[PDB]
Amino acid sequence: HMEGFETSDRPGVCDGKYYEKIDGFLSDIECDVLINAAIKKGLIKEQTWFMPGEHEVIDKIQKKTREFLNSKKHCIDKYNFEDVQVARYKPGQYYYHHYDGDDCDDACPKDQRLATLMVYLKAPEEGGGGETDFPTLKTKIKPKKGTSIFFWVADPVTRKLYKETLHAGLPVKSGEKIIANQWIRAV
Template identity: 45%
Template sequence: MKVKSSYIGLCLILIFIIISFSILSTPHIETFAELGFADDNEEYIYPTVYNNFISPKEANYILSQAEPKFTDSETIGSGVDTQIRKSKTAWLSKNDLTIKNIIQRVCAINNYSIENAEDLQVVKYGPGGFYNPHHDSTGDDNKESHEFLKLGGHRIATMLIYLNDDFEGGATRFVNLAKDIKPPKHGSILFYPLDKYNNKCHPKALHAGLPLSSGQKYIANVWIRQKPFINTVD
């Protein structure tokens, strides 16, 4: 009887060790998402322009919902810094039916669930407004980057929607592609922040919002993550 009890105890200990090792060795979001930057010669899918991606009614709805919610735009790790970007930002919930329909179209193009999508970001630029060259995901190995990745891994797709076009300047510049893109109103730019295999930020995805010389520029960003997005706001 004592031998049997010892055997059972030993088996329980072994099971506990196996389960513990399995939990510790399971890839978490921050380890699944690689930091750093891809080599410039890594495969990259170039930006695509969609004309009339949203309807005038959808554009007007986004603007009406965003206007009372605008606050100074922030950046990861820097907060509000008008030397990096000068704009206003609002967030619209993907639980809103109109917003959900727009985001679902982006997800369908990329074969991802809406669970992986963030809420819709709306950005307003006035005269002199800009956003310096930046990546939509993160390659830096710091606390802010790790916190960002915990929310669902890297951003793997961006749909940048131009809500209007009655302004001067304000094109989206892909710095390392030497390409400026400014779709007509309701058009959009689909691009991928990472290399083709969704591992690291790709240098060719580096982009900037060029300064406005006159008018107001309104854009909306749909972002899709590697994993279901964890919303810490709602």
């Protein structure tokens, strides 16, 4: 994603899509139900995690993530789900651009994280910033309650990172932001 010409002999990404967005992945009500469950697990002191079968909304997240990945069997085959994390962000918080996987070359972990499906459970207020930043792809995503972002982290074949999906949550300027992260590992 450079205006100036640069030759590119890098590996391709599934269907040429580094990220995909789905509105209404969860309903507003489902988001609030899950936020409240996470608060009761000690979210606010900021992150907490769920077991499979602990919560119905979490179970829906994994269910629908699998259904999405069923449509990508030409790109991925065997994979494993991590437990779902719920995390909160508020103004004046430290942030940093990173990859969700191991930045490896010849020694890639067999259980590399291959992708991430994140769900915005609560969005910042008006003029609240807190965008998801993909600086290398030169795009941000405005949080929206109920919306999911799926993005690739590593090549299922080589397990090397897609450096294109370097990302951060930018500072929240007003209100708060809560997300659920579903990480997807190779087997």
